[model samples]
Target: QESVKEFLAKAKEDFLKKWESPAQNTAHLDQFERIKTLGTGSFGRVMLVKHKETGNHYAMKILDKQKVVKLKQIEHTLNEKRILQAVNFPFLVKLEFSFKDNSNLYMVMEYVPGGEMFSHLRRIGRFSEPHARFYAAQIVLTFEYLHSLDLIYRDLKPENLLIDQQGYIQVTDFGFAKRVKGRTWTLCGTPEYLAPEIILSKGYNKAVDWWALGVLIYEMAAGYPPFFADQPIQIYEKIVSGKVRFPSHFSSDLKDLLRNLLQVDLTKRFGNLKNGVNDIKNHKWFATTDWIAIYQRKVEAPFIPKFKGPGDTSNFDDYEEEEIRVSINEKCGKEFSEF
Candidate 1:
């Protein structure tokens, strides 16, 4: 197993070499002025930028190529880009352009100004039944699309979900995604969202995504995951046991849905079967949902981000970009070379 120290060392070496250098003439700095740093990761930083000519705003994802290669993330990066390219759903973040400079590969994509779903849930403490049902419905559709392509979005936490201008959920971060015709075994994903089968390393299928969807809905309505714990081991235990407790305020129907969705026995889960997402769509909780209306963007979202215009950077504060610069510098090291 790769140690955290080893991962950090490799990441840092790649960052310095690829991203530490000053901008060069070949760099497309002319297209955008860094309004501010958006967010950072171990190998890159995202910048809130505007196109110089079109004035179109986008989140410019700057990644150190050397670090991606050194950390053995090339396949993951390719998978993310490919998945984004393949899926055209509104709930998925749109990829605009991708290019490389001397030391880094830059991915310019649509920027969702709304903060993470985690922040929204925390602020409201919990969601009303209608609101939670709305988001849940959208996710079910997304899962339907993904499973049709034999793909599984392994990571399905609030942090990986973004709300767009229309308050629609946009799923992002496909770094852990896998395409499985049958089943796959890879111990990854957030602890609280992992399926029992995943914990057992017994080769799980797309049903894992359904399990995560249940966790997401629960978090949306309760402001916390049912399996959360101070320690990772305890969290794993809770997740494997599939014990979920609903708040007393929850409705019987809502609680029943959650129970069915969170079932540890894959055979009994809501979306575990071939027609699972469709079954979920027809559930009583979504009885009032107009699938056609939501797909057409005719439905008005209950919440909108504080900012909408491409040039607006008001909501950027909630995100931290410095970590990205540091991560990039550390990962690239001296061997970093740009595109």
Candidate 2:
């Protein structure tokens, strides 16, 4: 038996070896066996699949080329592919290989067995202080690395965060992510987690990610966001007002951290300040956190998901397979030639 670190490294190394081979370009749907539908999306579906040669399981994300173009996400799709290939970190999802067919683009990724944190949160109602800290600490590291690369992860919700078999966080979905040198004006994010700066339509920076993280922390502890309304517009209005009403149960340290992160003023935000992520990392809420151990995945996770095997899909819901949509023309071929 090997440690989680050893196991993960070997799995990635084995796939990378195959991906770099001459057959990299030759990869297609025919070479893999689809096992079950893990999830469904607007453009297509993500199926749990097994590579015929290696017998290793992977999540096959299939995107309809014509639908991508119709949605005016051609550049975003290309950007996603570029970012997926660019990133290599423990807390983030790994893209093993990608190939294009006439009607669809296939992205074969590591199949994380523990499923979405959203599902777990729903079942457990809320996480304890230690459990939330375990997950949030990893997310802090995740934001630090992505920010170091000048990438803004506009989406940071429980739905996008998957718990691996080792109980570690694996951040998926980069559709709204962008490489911003200075500032970007993209009003894109979950309504509940949108930053004040974003709601104001002011050009925002990676500071927005810190704001989203703040919302996540609150949700983890309280089982709901600080601000909630019937409609998205109403949610934006509450966000702009910048009034966070913490429950009586929230500890002083937690409240302080949340107040700093969910600040309406960018100057008061923890991560946006002079020390950068160190400010948040060193906060009293995480005072007992062993960042080194957390990054190395040496610290014990508070909640370890139970599973029978590596290929278990019990954590994920059974999604019905929808027929693949046909591509209208060759537009995607020329537009996504780089992919």
Candidate 3:
């Protein structure tokens, strides 16, 4: 095997070469046939599109420039584009290309046949310990890779996780993602998944991802979040209280790991402390995990999504198209020049 230095150097050079080989005018909205609406977002909708020439399916993220700028998400939207373009991991969704028109920004991404992880979880109610462990391990790998690049995935939840055709995890939705060298003070993320530091409005870094991971694991096992309320304010109160009620069915190892992950103090948090991500990766709950096999996709997933084909929409819910005829007001248009 080659040494790390030469191996990494060669991969970097190869990627750069391939990145520069694309023609400037290769991508355009006219090149794809918009087949169906996969999902919708506050700014715009995601469509399942097929390449007119190549016949490849892709998730076309359509964002209204005006709505994006007005909602103060221009930076996040652009940042997502940049991150997706650079990231190519098995568990992370890939951005194939991007472009813009007079009113909207278009991001063409890989089309995973299986739908949201949330969909399957909703159907099954909750996952068995082994099933949750399998998904959790993949997410650990995903987070480790992102943190290595100094990026913080501010949003982490089942809704953003997709199941691929072969049943591997695909982490999607980078709208709230950011590259943080130090701490960032953005009051973003889903209320239920928000860490204590974020809820308290303190500057936080990659540690929050670990916190969310803990919550995600708990939800997978328990079929519900630790903190829940009818209102966001009430959820925040429960989160700050830092009280997690464990189900009697939980194993001792799972409870112990959750305790470490759900700790309010950053000093004791498993993934944020001295050992960093190694703590969670090597936890007793994951003692049976073959990390290498999981990464190489040799380990079989517990439940494979049932879908007919690549273009099947049976997994996704029907969504009505909401029109956005408004253009980016002249002044705000310049802010998205890079898009």
Candidate 4:
């Protein structure tokens, strides 16, 4: 444990050095045993895997190289790998190792037993003021670190928030993330969480992340998001309007914090204020939080997920295994061998 500046400098050096040097253990998937299907998506599936040598469990994300190419997600895929390699923080999911095979790309990540906050929120319905503040404070710290490096986590939602074995928050998933010193135009992120500037296709930067965080805070307080619609078009329309309704019982302090963060005008967004994140940190809602304790994970989570074992799959959804897709055309081998 060193100063944040010192650890960052050391981490950057080690990060670049490791990427430059060739890897041995991460070269193949033979050393890891798949325990179960942790989750799946359009790109690929993640399995609760174990490294035979260490007996350590990992969430192994396996991606189909050809399908990635077909979806034209090569940029997004590479961006995710690149960012994860470049940055390392306690609040972020650790990328233990990454490597590629002839047909698929692999990323070995630390196994978090508590699964997703999405699942927990769904189960408990909504959180009290303190519960929401606890999660939001941790996220603010993560945002500070990321924004320090000029990176914006474009995707910030409950699904991307994981609770570790100790019930600490870890922000994962970097597919839509990018380093933008100024503003960049990209119509991305969940429709309900999208900032007005983004929905308008106007150039935007980290303020968008703040907007998403505000939506997350609201969602955590209530049972659902500020805006809702069965159709994405309808959802986007609501978000673009930049108007939100709060539950009658929610504290005015909480509403004030959300309002400042969700400001449609980037100039007025809470994070962009004269005091930056400190403004939100000093907000009445978070006034009593021990930010340092939260950052150190000393603050106890209101709901600690029940776990049966280290290899428990109770928190994760069950899924049937699908046939692995391997394209006969082997462009990935030539292009992504270094992964």
lDDT per residue (tens digit) for residues 121-177 in model 4? 998999998888889998998987787677899999999999986778888888898
Q: In terms of lDDT, which candidate is stronger, 1 or 4?
A: 4
Deviation of model 4 at 26, angstroms: 3.4
Model 2 Cα lDDT, one tens digit per residue, 150-183 = 7788999999998886789999888888877989
Model 3 agreement with the true structure over 123-161: per-residue lDDT tens digits:
999999999999999999888777766789989999999
Alpha-carbon runs more than 4 Å astray in model 2: 1-26, 325-331
Name model 4 segments beyond 4 Å from true.
1-25, 323-329, 334-338
Candidate lDDT values, in order:
0.75, 0.84, 0.84, 0.83
Question: In model 3, how large is the Cα lDDT of residue 233?
Answer: 97
Report lDDT (Cα) of residue 15, candidate 4.
55
Model 4, residue 208: distance off in Å is 0.6
Error of 4 at 158 (Å): 0.5
Candidate 2 local lDDT, residue 106: 79
